[PDB]
């Protein structure tokens, strides 16, 4: 059991530990425990979650939790504060004052309340004055973009991006482009126009996309299309149908997405696990939505693309056990039409579909059923679930009679199993065991009907796996593949090449290779879906060194394996990933006797991997990655991840793999890719950024994004990784451009980069450990942060400068000595709080570093040029000073002749 009470303390403590993500969750979760008979026990909480939320930028929340607390006590200065603090952030300074103001007089003195009000004051002033300044900025383009009045595409387009830029650029500008809904009908018009260029339309959706990231605005959007609520919810979803190009659909879905995020106060990209109360509040809308996205899971009128979407849309927002809606939805979804009907799809194909479907439509339904599975937890549940997939398998099977028509059913019950196997595999394998399936397997497998012929050779190819208990139906099935293999019908031949390729120890390991080879290689002739398997096959023949070498050995197999991805898209991910991931050895394995003789395979061990990775990344290998990379897979990502990570460890390579959407991908990977996915993808990011110019790799704010990762990847500093590769990055990042360092800082990441300094046997990881900080304090924020305070910093920018038994560590803390000197308060914290200061100043004085005896003589010269109690000090050091005064090469006499200057 658990008590309302204590649980809070758990969060209270979290708030203090700095896990607001936790705190938020803990409080909210705690809040659930109590009720409306434990009065005071609650308000306290709203107040506190609001604290954390405010800390995690959940402003709309902070505010709502805040006010939810005042609900009890008018006073609650704690609340009024946070609220106004939040409100002012939502760009709404108005009542931001009346809270902060009222707060102040409740807690008469409070450097905080005051600090805010000072701000809010300068705020309400530049309010009306400034809003009607934007409003115009807006209405001026609202003409160009929408309201007719604009000439030539180009401009109408630009005028849009602006609204978009201006839209998300500030919580304010958003409300500004929203123009109180004016935006909706204008965007809808671009949608409804048949001719309007796609991009135009997409861009205009993306403006709206953003606008509705606001729960209230969004929740308005949903209901705003018809007096009858339910009807409106239809309209929104069904927007993705108006048109039907890849992007138009995609860009649209997000709109639907927002509706979820808004409805249950959740956001998967922020890790904002839904507030149980909100969802529960406006629950009625969450019903209507799913219901609709579900009912269109089958409407034959609903396109394919759109279909695939309502599935992912379904996936991402229903699985409570994963960034989803609260618990309980996923259940009533299987307890009713949902599951069954989500299965009804699992048994469809592009060659027999009761409602539009595409080659890709499977993946989406696999993983999606796989998660609906996982998102079940309870036994009482898992039961009611299998006691359904089963109630399905029955009705479906007991209808597979042998006859022209009935045969349809075997294709269904068949595919229905090829999926169920790729998805919730357990419920799937635990299905082909009731061999009542194996006969039909044969029946069709031997008939004349090329289809049943092939999709039977695939209902097995898709049952290979690992263990047994299922090698029952495999027993007879493998041979069958051998027979079907002979077939002249390519489709049935290939679909047989797999499995018979996916086993191993006519079927020679090489044989099966030369097969998928010409099978594939044969571009112009053999179709695409044919080679989708030829790719899958070869893929299994890539876990053996020998073959790996053979593959890459032939250009045409790369030039084409690429060309395929550049067309098959997310249909060759799991596969082409394992091909690109295995020839690079991107896979990691845990690390009297012997067995070292077998760990050989020189084609695997040694820089023989590089041989491959080289001419491999030569033949696309990257363009191919970005290609079949769009796929909420998880592992496929993780695959292209290591396929990149292990691609950017060769220098001259990343020189182009950067120009081939490199930075983009592994970056996307950061968010999308699961587990090691992000992890290994980020290392790729960091291990790409180094001997690379940040101007030609991280422009357009690409930078700002490339921080949360390699500033969270540093955290793991107990040892390992490319923490160092992550330094030459933040070093080549915080360097040119302020804003950059801004994040690096806001990252709450300094407590760690501040230790690549505190090292001994780590010369290298310290070399940049400093070169970074030079470009970090390189512009206030952290400059005034390192001087005034009184935290033993300056103590080292001086030692390191002199302590040059190596170098670098100097040149870094040297120009980090000269520029930190020009500040007066600096010359203070030192001299008085820097014992044996001369001795140090002495070494660095002319220390044979033909550089530090210039950055030292400057960070030394200016220590006296400012403040005279220091200008005095001529004890021992003032000697060397005179030194440089001849034709002794090293121009270090520069900051040298400057040291003397401070004598006047």
């Amino acid at each position: 059991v658990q008590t309302a009470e204590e649980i809070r303390d758990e969060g209270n403590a979290a708030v203090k530990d700095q896990d607001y993500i936790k705190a938020d969750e803990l409080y909210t979760e705690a809040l659930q425990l109590t009720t409306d008979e434990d009065k005071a026990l609650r308000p306290v909480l709203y107040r506190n979650r609001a604290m954390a939320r405010l800390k995690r930028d959940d402003f709309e929340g902070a505010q709502s939790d805040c006010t939810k607390a005042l609900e009890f006590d008018g006073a609650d200065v704690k609340a009024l504060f946070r609220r106004s603090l939040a409100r002012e952030q939502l760009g709404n300074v108005g009542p931001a004052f009346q809270d902060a103001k009222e707060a102040l007089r409740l807690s008469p003195n409070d450097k905080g309340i005051v600090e805010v009000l000072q701000r809010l004051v300068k705020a309400n002033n530049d309010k009306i004055k400034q809003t009607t300044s934007l409003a115009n900025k807006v209405t001026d383009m609202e003409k160009l973009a929408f309201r007719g009045e604009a000439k030539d595409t180009e401009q109408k387009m630009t005028a849009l991006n602006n609204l978009l830029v201006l839209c998300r650029e500030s919580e304010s500008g958003a409300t500004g482009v929203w123009n109180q809904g004016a935006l909706v009908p204008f965007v809808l018009n671009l949608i409804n126009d048949a001719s309007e260029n796609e991009e135009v339309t997409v861009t205009a959706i993306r403006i709206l996309d953003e606008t509705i990231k606001n729960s209230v605005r969004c929740m308005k959007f949903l209901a705003m299309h018809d007096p009858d609520g339910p009807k409106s919810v239809r309209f929104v979803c069904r927007l993705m149908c108006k048109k039907s190009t890849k992007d138009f659909v995609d860009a649209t879905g997000i709109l639907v997405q927002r509706v979820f995020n808004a409805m249950a106060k959740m956001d998967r990209q922020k890790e904002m696990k839904p507030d149980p109360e909100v969802a529960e509040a406006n629950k009625i809308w969450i019903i209507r939505v799913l219901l609709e996205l579900q009912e269109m899971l089958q409407d034959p009128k609903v396109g394919a693309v759109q279909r695939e979407t309502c599935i992912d849309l379904f996936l991402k927002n229903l699985m409570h056990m994963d960034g989803g809606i609260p618990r309980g939805w996923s259940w009533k979804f299987v307890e009713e039409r949902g599951l069954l009907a989500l299965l009804d799809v699992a048994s469809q194909i592009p060659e027999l579909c009761e409602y539009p479907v595409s080659a890709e439509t499977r993946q989406h339904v696999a993983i999606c059923l796989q998660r609906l599975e996982e998102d079940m937890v309870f036994d009482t549940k898992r039961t009611i679930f299998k006691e359904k997939v089963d109630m399905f398998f029955n009705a479906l099977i007991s209808r597979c009679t042998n006859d022209d028509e009935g045969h349809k059913y075997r294709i269904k019950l068949s595919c229905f199993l090829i999926t169920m196997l790729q998805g919730p595999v357990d419920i799937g394998i635990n299905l082909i065991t009731n061999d009542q399936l194996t006969p039909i397997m044969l029946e069709m497998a031997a008939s004349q009907d090329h289809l049943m012929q092939g999709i039977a050779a695939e209902l097995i190819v898709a049952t290979v796996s690992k263990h047994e208990r299922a090698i029952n139906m495999l027993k007879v099935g493998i041979p069958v593949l051998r027979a079907l293999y002979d077939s002249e019908d390519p489709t049935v031949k290939v679909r047989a090449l797999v499995g018979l390729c996916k086993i191993g120890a006519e079927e020679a390991v090489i044989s099966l290779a030369k097969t998928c080879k010409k099978f594939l290689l044969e571009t112009e002739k053999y179709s695409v879906d044919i080679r989708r398997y030829a790719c899958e096959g070869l893929s299994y023949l890539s876990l053996d060194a020998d073959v790996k070498e053979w593959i890459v050995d032939d250009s045409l197999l790369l030039k084409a394996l690429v060309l395929l991805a550049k067309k098959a898209g997310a249909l060759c991910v799991y596969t082409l990933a394992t091909i690109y991931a295995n020839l690079s050895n991107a896979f990691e394995k845990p690390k009297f006797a012997k067995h070292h003789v077998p760990e050989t395979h020189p084609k695997d061990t040694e820089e023989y991997v590089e041989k491959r990775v080289r001419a491999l990344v030569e033949e696309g290998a990257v363009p191919a990655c970005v290609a079949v990379s769009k796929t909420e897979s998880k592992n496929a990502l993780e695959l292209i991840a290591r396929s990149l990570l292990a691609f950017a460890e060769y220098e001259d390579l990343r020189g182009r793999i950067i120009a081939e959407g490199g930075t983009v991908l592994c970056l996307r990977l950061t968010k999308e890719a699961s587990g090691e996915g992000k992890i290994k993808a980020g290392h790729a990011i960091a291990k790409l950024g180094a001997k690379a110019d940040p101007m030609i790799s991280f422009p357009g704010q690409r930078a700002y994004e490339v921080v949360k990762p390699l500033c969270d990847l540093l955290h793991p500093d107990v040892e390992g990784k490319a923490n160092y590769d992550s330094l030459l990055t933040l070093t080549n990042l915080a360097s040119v451009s302020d804003s950059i360092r801004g994040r690096i800082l806001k990252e709450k990441a300094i407590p760690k980069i501040e230790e690549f300094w505190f090292m001994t046997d780590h010369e290298h990881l310290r070399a940049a450990a400093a070169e970074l900080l030079l470009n970090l304090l390189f512009f206030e924020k952290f400059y005034e942060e390192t001087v005034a305070p009184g935290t033993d910093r300056l103590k080292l920018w001086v030692l390191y400068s002199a302590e040059v038994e190596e170098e670098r560590l100097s040149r870094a803390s040297a120009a980090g000595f000269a520029i930190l000197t020009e500040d007066e308060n600096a010359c203070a914290r030192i001299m008085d709080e820097i014992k044996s200061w001369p001795e140090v100043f002495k070494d660095i004085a002319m220390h044979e570093d033909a550089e530090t005896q210039r950055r030292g003589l400057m960070g030394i010269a200016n220590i006296m040029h400012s403040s005279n109690k220091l200008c005095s000090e001529i004890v021992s050091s003032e000697v060397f000073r005179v030194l440089v005064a001849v034709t002794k090469l090293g121009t270090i006499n520069q900051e040298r002749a400057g040291s003397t200057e401070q004598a006047k």
Binding site: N12, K16, V44, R47, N48, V77, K78, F81, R82, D110
Partner: peptide
Amino acid sequence: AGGPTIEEVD
């Protein structure tokens, strides 16, 4: 010094 500077919960 402390934390009652309402940067603390309760």
